[PDB]
Amino acid sequence: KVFGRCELAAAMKRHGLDNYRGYSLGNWVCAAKFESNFNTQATNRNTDGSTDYGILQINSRWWCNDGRTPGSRNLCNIPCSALLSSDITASVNCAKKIVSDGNGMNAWVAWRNRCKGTDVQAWIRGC
Ligand SMILES: [Cl-]
């Protein structure tokens, strides 16, 4: 599915992302916009043989297991296929582990380049 902006904000808030590990909700909404364009089924292959999966483009080298990525660590202990559900639970649970690993939201390239430093609260304004 393709979430609306406020629709995703409300779902992410219900799943505990607002202010999680220091990151207000607008950060997470902006990240999803620029990672997946709010599409729960987005996938993108990378040069290292990994693929990024779902609404938050979670990577198959470090975080989820897709069975075809060399050097897999599966630190979220989740099959990547689960991260293509229209229900965001598995992606949020893995994102919480990623953002707790020591480098904040820097794991999300699109967030680093297109959200960080902007007024991210605009992403939840009006919701
Ligand atoms: Cl604005």
Short mmCIF file of N, CA and C and ligand atoms in Angstrom, two decimals:
data_model
loop_
_atom_site.label_atom_id
_atom_site.label_comp_id
_atom_site.label_asym_id
_atom_site.label_seq_id
_atom_site.Cartn_x
_atom_site.Cartn_y
_atom_site.Cartn_z
N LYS A 1 0.85 -1.23 0.00
CA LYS A 1 0.00 0.00 0.00
C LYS A 1 0.86 1.24 0.00
N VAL A 2 0.23 2.34 -0.41
CA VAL A 2 0.83 3.66 -0.39
C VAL A 2 0.12 4.46 0.69
N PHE A 3 0.84 4.78 1.76
CA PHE A 3 0.27 5.56 2.85
C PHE A 3 0.17 7.02 2.45
N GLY A 4 -0.86 7.69 2.97
CA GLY A 4 -0.84 9.14 3.04
C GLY A 4 0.08 9.62 4.15
N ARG A 5 0.47 10.89 4.07
CA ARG A 5 1.40 11.47 5.04
C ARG A 5 0.85 11.38 6.46
N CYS A 6 -0.31 11.97 6.71
CA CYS A 6 -0.84 11.93 8.07
C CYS A 6 -1.26 10.52 8.46
N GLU A 7 -1.73 9.73 7.49
CA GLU A 7 -2.05 8.34 7.77
C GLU A 7 -0.84 7.59 8.31
N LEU A 8 0.31 7.77 7.68
CA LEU A 8 1.51 7.11 8.17
C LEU A 8 1.96 7.70 9.51
N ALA A 9 1.88 9.02 9.66
CA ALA A 9 2.25 9.63 10.93
C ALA A 9 1.46 9.00 12.08
N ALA A 10 0.15 8.85 11.90
CA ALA A 10 -0.68 8.30 12.96
C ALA A 10 -0.29 6.86 13.26
N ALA A 11 -0.04 6.06 12.22
CA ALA A 11 0.37 4.68 12.42
C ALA A 11 1.72 4.59 13.12
N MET A 12 2.68 5.41 12.70
CA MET A 12 3.99 5.40 13.33
C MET A 12 3.90 5.83 14.78
N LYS A 13 3.03 6.80 15.07
CA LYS A 13 2.85 7.21 16.46
C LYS A 13 2.24 6.09 17.30
N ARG A 14 1.25 5.37 16.75
CA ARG A 14 0.68 4.25 17.49
C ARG A 14 1.73 3.19 17.77
N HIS A 15 2.70 3.04 16.87
CA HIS A 15 3.77 2.06 17.03
C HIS A 15 4.96 2.59 17.83
N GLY A 16 4.83 3.77 18.46
CA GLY A 16 5.84 4.23 19.40
C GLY A 16 7.05 4.94 18.83
N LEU A 17 7.00 5.40 17.59
CA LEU A 17 8.17 6.07 17.01
C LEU A 17 8.31 7.54 17.41
N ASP A 18 7.26 8.21 17.90
CA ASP A 18 7.39 9.64 18.20
C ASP A 18 8.39 9.83 19.34
N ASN A 19 9.51 10.49 19.04
CA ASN A 19 10.57 10.81 19.99
C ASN A 19 11.42 9.61 20.36
N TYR A 20 11.23 8.47 19.68
CA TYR A 20 11.96 7.26 19.98
C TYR A 20 13.46 7.49 19.81
N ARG A 21 14.22 7.18 20.86
CA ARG A 21 15.67 7.36 20.87
C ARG A 21 16.07 8.76 20.42
N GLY A 22 15.23 9.75 20.74
CA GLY A 22 15.53 11.13 20.45
C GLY A 22 15.04 11.68 19.13
N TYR A 23 14.25 10.92 18.37
CA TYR A 23 13.85 11.34 17.03
C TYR A 23 12.35 11.57 16.98
N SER A 24 11.96 12.83 16.87
CA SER A 24 10.56 13.18 16.79
C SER A 24 9.91 12.56 15.56
N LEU A 25 8.58 12.46 15.62
CA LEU A 25 7.80 11.74 14.61
C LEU A 25 8.06 12.25 13.20
N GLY A 26 8.21 13.55 13.02
CA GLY A 26 8.43 14.08 11.69
C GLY A 26 9.67 13.53 11.02
N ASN A 27 10.70 13.19 11.80
CA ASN A 27 11.88 12.55 11.22
C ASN A 27 11.52 11.24 10.53
N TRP A 28 10.68 10.44 11.17
CA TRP A 28 10.32 9.12 10.67
C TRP A 28 9.44 9.24 9.44
N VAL A 29 8.53 10.22 9.43
CA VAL A 29 7.65 10.43 8.29
C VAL A 29 8.45 10.92 7.10
N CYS A 30 9.35 11.89 7.33
CA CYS A 30 10.22 12.38 6.26
C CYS A 30 11.10 11.25 5.73
N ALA A 31 11.66 10.44 6.62
CA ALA A 31 12.47 9.31 6.18
C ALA A 31 11.68 8.41 5.25
N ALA A 32 10.46 8.04 5.65
CA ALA A 32 9.66 7.16 4.81
C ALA A 32 9.35 7.81 3.46
N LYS A 33 9.05 9.11 3.46
CA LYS A 33 8.77 9.78 2.19
C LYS A 33 9.91 9.60 1.22
N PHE A 34 11.12 9.88 1.67
CA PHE A 34 12.24 9.90 0.74
C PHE A 34 12.89 8.54 0.57
N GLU A 35 12.66 7.59 1.49
CA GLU A 35 13.16 6.23 1.29
C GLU A 35 12.28 5.43 0.33
N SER A 36 10.95 5.47 0.51
CA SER A 36 10.04 4.57 -0.19
C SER A 36 8.88 5.27 -0.87
N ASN A 37 8.81 6.60 -0.80
CA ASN A 37 7.64 7.35 -1.24
C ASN A 37 6.36 6.82 -0.60
N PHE A 38 6.47 6.37 0.64
CA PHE A 38 5.34 5.88 1.44
C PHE A 38 4.78 4.54 0.94
N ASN A 39 5.51 3.79 0.10
CA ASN A 39 5.05 2.52 -0.45
C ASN A 39 5.65 1.39 0.38
N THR A 40 4.79 0.58 0.98
CA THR A 40 5.25 -0.53 1.79
C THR A 40 5.95 -1.63 1.00
N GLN A 41 5.86 -1.62 -0.34
CA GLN A 41 6.47 -2.66 -1.16
C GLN A 41 7.69 -2.21 -1.93
N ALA A 42 8.20 -1.01 -1.66
CA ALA A 42 9.37 -0.55 -2.38
C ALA A 42 10.57 -1.46 -2.09
N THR A 43 11.34 -1.76 -3.14
CA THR A 43 12.57 -2.53 -2.99
C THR A 43 13.63 -1.97 -3.93
N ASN A 44 14.88 -1.96 -3.48
CA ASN A 44 15.98 -1.44 -4.28
C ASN A 44 17.24 -2.26 -4.07
N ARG A 45 17.80 -2.77 -5.16
CA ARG A 45 19.01 -3.57 -5.12
C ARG A 45 20.24 -2.65 -5.07
N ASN A 46 21.26 -3.08 -4.32
CA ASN A 46 22.49 -2.33 -4.12
C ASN A 46 23.69 -3.06 -4.73
N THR A 47 24.79 -2.32 -4.89
CA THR A 47 25.98 -2.88 -5.52
C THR A 47 26.58 -4.05 -4.74
N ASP A 48 26.41 -4.08 -3.42
CA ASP A 48 27.03 -5.13 -2.62
C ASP A 48 26.21 -6.42 -2.61
N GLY A 49 25.17 -6.52 -3.43
CA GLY A 49 24.32 -7.69 -3.46
C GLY A 49 23.17 -7.64 -2.49
N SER A 50 23.11 -6.63 -1.64
CA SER A 50 22.00 -6.47 -0.72
C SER A 50 20.84 -5.77 -1.42
N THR A 51 19.70 -5.80 -0.76
CA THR A 51 18.50 -5.12 -1.20
C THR A 51 17.92 -4.40 0.01
N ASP A 52 17.32 -3.22 -0.23
CA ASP A 52 16.59 -2.48 0.79
C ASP A 52 15.10 -2.73 0.61
N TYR A 53 14.39 -2.97 1.72
CA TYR A 53 13.03 -3.47 1.69
C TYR A 53 12.06 -2.58 2.46
N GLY A 54 10.96 -2.22 1.80
CA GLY A 54 9.79 -1.70 2.46
C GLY A 54 9.79 -0.21 2.71
N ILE A 55 8.82 0.18 3.54
CA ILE A 55 8.51 1.58 3.83
C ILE A 55 9.72 2.34 4.36
N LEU A 56 10.61 1.67 5.11
CA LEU A 56 11.82 2.28 5.63
C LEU A 56 13.09 1.69 5.02
N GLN A 57 12.98 0.97 3.91
CA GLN A 57 14.14 0.57 3.12
C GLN A 57 15.23 -0.08 3.99
N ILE A 58 14.82 -1.13 4.69
CA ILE A 58 15.70 -1.84 5.60
C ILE A 58 16.60 -2.80 4.81
N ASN A 59 17.89 -2.77 5.12
CA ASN A 59 18.92 -3.41 4.32
C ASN A 59 19.14 -4.88 4.70
N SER A 60 19.33 -5.71 3.68
CA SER A 60 19.49 -7.16 3.85
C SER A 60 20.92 -7.60 4.13
N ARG A 61 21.90 -6.70 4.16
CA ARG A 61 23.22 -7.12 4.59
C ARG A 61 23.32 -7.12 6.11
N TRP A 62 22.81 -6.10 6.77
CA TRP A 62 22.96 -6.00 8.21
C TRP A 62 21.71 -6.39 8.98
N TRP A 63 20.51 -6.11 8.47
CA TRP A 63 19.34 -6.02 9.34
C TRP A 63 18.32 -7.12 9.15
N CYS A 64 17.89 -7.40 7.93
CA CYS A 64 16.94 -8.47 7.68
C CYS A 64 17.57 -9.52 6.77
N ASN A 65 17.02 -10.73 6.80
CA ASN A 65 17.55 -11.84 6.02
C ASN A 65 16.70 -12.06 4.78
N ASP A 66 17.30 -11.95 3.60
CA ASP A 66 16.62 -12.26 2.35
C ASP A 66 17.17 -13.50 1.65
N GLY A 67 18.09 -14.23 2.29
CA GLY A 67 18.58 -15.48 1.74
C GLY A 67 19.50 -15.36 0.54
N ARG A 68 19.73 -14.16 0.01
CA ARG A 68 20.55 -13.99 -1.19
C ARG A 68 21.63 -12.93 -1.03
N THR A 69 21.91 -12.49 0.19
CA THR A 69 22.86 -11.40 0.40
C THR A 69 24.12 -11.92 1.07
N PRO A 70 25.29 -11.81 0.45
CA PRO A 70 26.51 -12.25 1.14
C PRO A 70 26.81 -11.37 2.34
N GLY A 71 27.36 -11.99 3.38
CA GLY A 71 27.74 -11.29 4.59
C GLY A 71 26.58 -10.95 5.50
N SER A 72 25.44 -11.62 5.32
CA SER A 72 24.22 -11.27 6.06
C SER A 72 24.46 -11.40 7.56
N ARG A 73 23.95 -10.43 8.33
CA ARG A 73 23.99 -10.51 9.78
C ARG A 73 22.62 -10.64 10.45
N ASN A 74 21.55 -10.25 9.76
CA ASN A 74 20.18 -10.41 10.26
C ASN A 74 20.02 -9.91 11.70
N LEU A 75 20.49 -8.69 11.95
CA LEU A 75 20.47 -8.20 13.32
C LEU A 75 19.06 -7.87 13.82
N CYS A 76 18.09 -7.71 12.93
CA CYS A 76 16.69 -7.60 13.36
C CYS A 76 16.00 -8.94 13.54
N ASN A 77 16.66 -10.04 13.19
CA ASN A 77 16.09 -11.38 13.28
C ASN A 77 14.71 -11.42 12.64
N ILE A 78 14.66 -11.07 11.36
CA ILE A 78 13.39 -11.02 10.65
C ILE A 78 13.65 -11.31 9.18
N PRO A 79 12.82 -12.12 8.53
CA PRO A 79 12.92 -12.25 7.07
C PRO A 79 12.56 -10.93 6.41
N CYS A 80 13.33 -10.55 5.39
CA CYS A 80 13.04 -9.30 4.69
C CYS A 80 11.65 -9.31 4.09
N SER A 81 11.14 -10.49 3.71
CA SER A 81 9.82 -10.55 3.10
C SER A 81 8.75 -9.99 4.02
N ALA A 82 8.93 -10.13 5.34
CA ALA A 82 7.95 -9.62 6.28
C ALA A 82 7.88 -8.11 6.24
N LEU A 83 8.94 -7.47 5.77
CA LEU A 83 9.01 -6.02 5.74
C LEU A 83 8.32 -5.44 4.52
N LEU A 84 7.71 -6.27 3.68
CA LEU A 84 6.90 -5.82 2.56
C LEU A 84 5.41 -5.93 2.84
N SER A 85 5.03 -6.23 4.08
CA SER A 85 3.64 -6.20 4.48
C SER A 85 3.09 -4.77 4.44
N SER A 86 1.78 -4.66 4.22
CA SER A 86 1.11 -3.36 4.34
C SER A 86 0.99 -2.90 5.79
N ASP A 87 1.14 -3.82 6.73
CA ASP A 87 1.19 -3.52 8.16
C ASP A 87 2.63 -3.21 8.54
N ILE A 88 2.86 -2.05 9.18
CA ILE A 88 4.21 -1.55 9.40
C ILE A 88 4.91 -2.13 10.63
N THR A 89 4.28 -3.06 11.35
CA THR A 89 4.82 -3.53 12.63
C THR A 89 6.26 -4.02 12.50
N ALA A 90 6.52 -4.93 11.57
CA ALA A 90 7.85 -5.54 11.50
C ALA A 90 8.90 -4.50 11.11
N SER A 91 8.55 -3.59 10.20
CA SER A 91 9.49 -2.55 9.81
C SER A 91 9.78 -1.60 10.96
N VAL A 92 8.76 -1.23 11.73
CA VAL A 92 8.98 -0.35 12.88
C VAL A 92 9.85 -1.05 13.92
N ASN A 93 9.55 -2.32 14.21
CA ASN A 93 10.33 -3.02 15.22
C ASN A 93 11.79 -3.10 14.82
N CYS A 94 12.06 -3.36 13.55
CA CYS A 94 13.44 -3.39 13.09
C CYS A 94 14.07 -2.00 13.10
N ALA A 95 13.33 -0.99 12.65
CA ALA A 95 13.84 0.38 12.70
C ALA A 95 14.25 0.77 14.12
N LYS A 96 13.49 0.34 15.13
CA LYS A 96 13.85 0.67 16.50
C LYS A 96 15.20 0.07 16.86
N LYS A 97 15.47 -1.15 16.38
CA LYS A 97 16.77 -1.76 16.63
C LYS A 97 17.88 -1.02 15.89
N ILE A 98 17.62 -0.62 14.64
CA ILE A 98 18.62 0.08 13.84
C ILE A 98 19.01 1.39 14.51
N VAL A 99 18.02 2.17 14.94
CA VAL A 99 18.28 3.51 15.46
C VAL A 99 18.90 3.47 16.84
N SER A 100 18.86 2.31 17.50
CA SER A 100 19.47 2.09 18.80
C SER A 100 20.89 1.58 18.71
N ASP A 101 21.39 1.33 17.50
CA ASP A 101 22.67 0.65 17.34
C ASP A 101 23.88 1.56 17.52
N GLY A 102 23.70 2.88 17.56
CA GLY A 102 24.82 3.75 17.88
C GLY A 102 25.06 4.90 16.93
N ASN A 103 24.40 4.91 15.77
CA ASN A 103 24.56 6.00 14.81
C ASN A 103 23.22 6.66 14.48
N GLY A 104 22.25 6.57 15.39
CA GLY A 104 20.98 7.28 15.21
C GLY A 104 20.30 6.95 13.90
N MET A 105 19.71 7.96 13.26
CA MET A 105 19.01 7.77 11.99
C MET A 105 19.94 7.85 10.79
N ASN A 106 21.25 7.93 11.01
CA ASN A 106 22.18 8.03 9.90
C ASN A 106 22.17 6.79 9.02
N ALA A 107 21.62 5.67 9.52
CA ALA A 107 21.48 4.47 8.70
C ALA A 107 20.63 4.72 7.47
N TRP A 108 19.73 5.70 7.51
CA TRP A 108 18.82 5.98 6.41
C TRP A 108 19.43 7.09 5.56
N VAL A 109 20.00 6.70 4.41
CA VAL A 109 20.69 7.66 3.54
C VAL A 109 19.78 8.81 3.13
N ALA A 110 18.53 8.50 2.76
CA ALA A 110 17.62 9.55 2.32
C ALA A 110 17.30 10.50 3.45
N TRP A 111 17.18 9.99 4.68
CA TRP A 111 16.96 10.87 5.82
C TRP A 111 18.17 11.78 6.03
N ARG A 112 19.37 11.20 5.98
CA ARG A 112 20.59 11.96 6.18
C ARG A 112 20.70 13.09 5.17
N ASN A 113 20.35 12.81 3.92
CA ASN A 113 20.60 13.76 2.85
C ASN A 113 19.45 14.73 2.62
N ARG A 114 18.21 14.33 2.91
CA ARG A 114 17.06 15.11 2.49
C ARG A 114 16.13 15.51 3.63
N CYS A 115 16.36 15.02 4.86
CA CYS A 115 15.55 15.37 6.02
C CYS A 115 16.36 16.07 7.10
N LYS A 116 17.50 15.50 7.48
CA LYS A 116 18.29 16.05 8.58
C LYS A 116 18.63 17.51 8.30
N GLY A 117 18.42 18.36 9.30
CA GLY A 117 18.70 19.78 9.19
C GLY A 117 17.53 20.62 8.72
N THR A 118 16.50 19.99 8.17
CA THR A 118 15.28 20.70 7.81
C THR A 118 14.31 20.70 8.98
N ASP A 119 13.27 21.52 8.87
CA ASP A 119 12.18 21.54 9.84
C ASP A 119 11.30 20.30 9.66
N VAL A 120 11.67 19.21 10.33
CA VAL A 120 10.98 17.95 10.09
C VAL A 120 9.58 17.94 10.70
N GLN A 121 9.29 18.83 11.65
CA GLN A 121 7.95 18.88 12.22
C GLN A 121 6.90 19.20 11.15
N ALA A 122 7.30 19.84 10.05
CA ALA A 122 6.35 20.10 8.98
C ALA A 122 5.70 18.81 8.48
N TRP A 123 6.40 17.68 8.60
CA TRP A 123 5.86 16.42 8.09
C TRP A 123 4.67 15.92 8.89
N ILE A 124 4.46 16.39 10.12
CA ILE A 124 3.28 16.01 10.89
C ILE A 124 2.31 17.16 11.07
N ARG A 125 2.60 18.31 10.50
CA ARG A 125 1.74 19.47 10.67
C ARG A 125 0.40 19.23 9.98
N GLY A 126 -0.68 19.63 10.65
CA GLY A 126 -2.01 19.43 10.12
C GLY A 126 -2.62 18.07 10.39
N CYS A 127 -1.88 17.15 10.99
CA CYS A 127 -2.37 15.78 11.19
C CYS A 127 -3.16 15.65 12.49
CL CL B 1 7.19 24.05 5.86
#
